[PDB]
Amino acid sequence: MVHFHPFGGVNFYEMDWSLKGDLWAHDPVIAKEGSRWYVFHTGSGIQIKTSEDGVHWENMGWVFPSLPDWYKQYVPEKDEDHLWAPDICFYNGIYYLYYSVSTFGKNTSVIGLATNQTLDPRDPDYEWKDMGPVIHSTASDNYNAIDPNVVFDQEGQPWLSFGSFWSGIQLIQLDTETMKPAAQAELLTIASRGEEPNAIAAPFIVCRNGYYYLFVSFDFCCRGIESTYKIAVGRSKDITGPYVDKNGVSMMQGGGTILDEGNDRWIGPGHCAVYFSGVSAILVNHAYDALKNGEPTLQIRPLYWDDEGWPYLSV
């Protein structure tokens, strides 16, 4: 359905989603090129996994063997190589991979962009090119420049949403030829718990049947079995909002309908992505494995939509 997140002839609803293989993942996204599937997720130099069928996964290296020097202009206290929360989209033959450079609990952060002609390392044209910073935050800003997501609207215009804590979820128009915001582009805040510490993060926007759906993660990641992350959603007819949940509550005031808050087995599901193929759709996220000391684990499940258009997972 979605040209910039294409999955080909796959039908997500008629597939076994009992995942196997190397499933350690935190903040995943997924892309498909030809018959090959790829996961990008948080880790050293942006970790990659690949699959033939979307179900059996195996590790596939990383994007950056060495971090670009320019990171230190934005995040000088960072002294490890872990890059956070990548986002992948495909436009006019180029793969655009956004990602976050940050340190935990601070908003000295920057979102970068890498591009490639192909996702397939066997291709002679495979090369992740460092296309530099996209947007950043300093301790003087009231937002945190991590957790990117790109969506192209109805008119074909690209937009970037991002954010984690501080004032919450931000939105800014991208220019098509740069895939970066204009220097004077307005930064809009589109979702917030409305109170401290403002535990909202990991935005992902999709368009379906005349509405934009803003998926976010509430509460606290990164605590293993003690994590409290949950996936929430609201919607808006216009991409700039207002985003409102099932109950009429604005997502700027803590609104958000809970899609998954986990259970005793899979704790703290969160940092999600939503993809379509034909009439089918999937939710992708990580969750913390209660039987493997909280190890973050890739989840992929079919995502359904009810008569009013709201998403739901099956039992």
Ligand X SMILES: OC[C@@H]1O[C@@H](OC[C@@H]2O[C@@H](OC[C@@H]3O[C@@H](OC[C@@H]4O[C@@H](OC[C@@H]5O[C@@H](O)[C@H](O)[C@H]5O)[C@H](O)[C@H]4O)[C@H](O)[C@H]3O)[C@H](O)[C@H]2O)[C@H](O)[C@H]1O
Which residues of this chain interact with Ca ion, rule CB under 5 A? 85
Q: Residue 200 binds which entry of Ca ion, ligand X, none, with Cβ cut-offs from 5 to 8 Å by kind?
A: none
For ligand X, give the closer residue by CB, 44 or 240. 44
212, interface contact from ligand X, Ca ion, none, CB < 5-8 Å by kind: none
- DSSP type of residue 78: -
The 10 Å CB-count burial string (b at 16+, else e) for 59-69 is ebebbbeebee
Look at residues 160, 144, 247 and name the one whose alpha carbon lies nearest to residue 197: 144
Residue 47 interface partner, choices ligand X, Ca ion, none, CB cut-off 5-8 Å depending on type: none
- Binding site partner of 289, from Ca ion, ligand X, none, Cβ cut-off 5-8 A by kind: none
Q: Nearer to ligand X by C-beta: 50 or 227?
A: 227
Nearer to ligand X, 57 or 84 (CB): 84
179 binds, among Ca ion, ligand X, none (CB under 5 to 8 A by kind): none
Q: Of the two residues 79 and 125, which places its CB atom closer to ligand X in the complex? A: 79
Shortest spacing between CB 271 and ligand X, in angstroms = 5
CB of 256 to ligand X, least distance (A): 15
User: What is the contact surface with ligand X in residues (CB under 6 A)?
Assistant: 26-27, 42, 82, 84-85, 100, 102, 104-105, 144, 146-147, 164-166, 196-198, 201-202, 221-222, 271
Q: Nearest approach, Cβ of 172 to ligand X (angstroms)?
A: 18
- Which residue number, 132 or 197, has a Cβ lying nearer to ligand X? 197
- Closest contact distance (angstroms) between CB of 37 and ligand X is 22
Distance CA 230, CA 270 (A): 5
CB of 239 to ligand X, least distance (A): 21
- Cβ at position 74, least distance to ligand X in Å: 14
Nearer to Ca ion, 30 or 85 (CB): 85
Which does residue 49 bind out of Ca ion, ligand X, none, counting CB within 5 to 8 angstroms by kind?
none
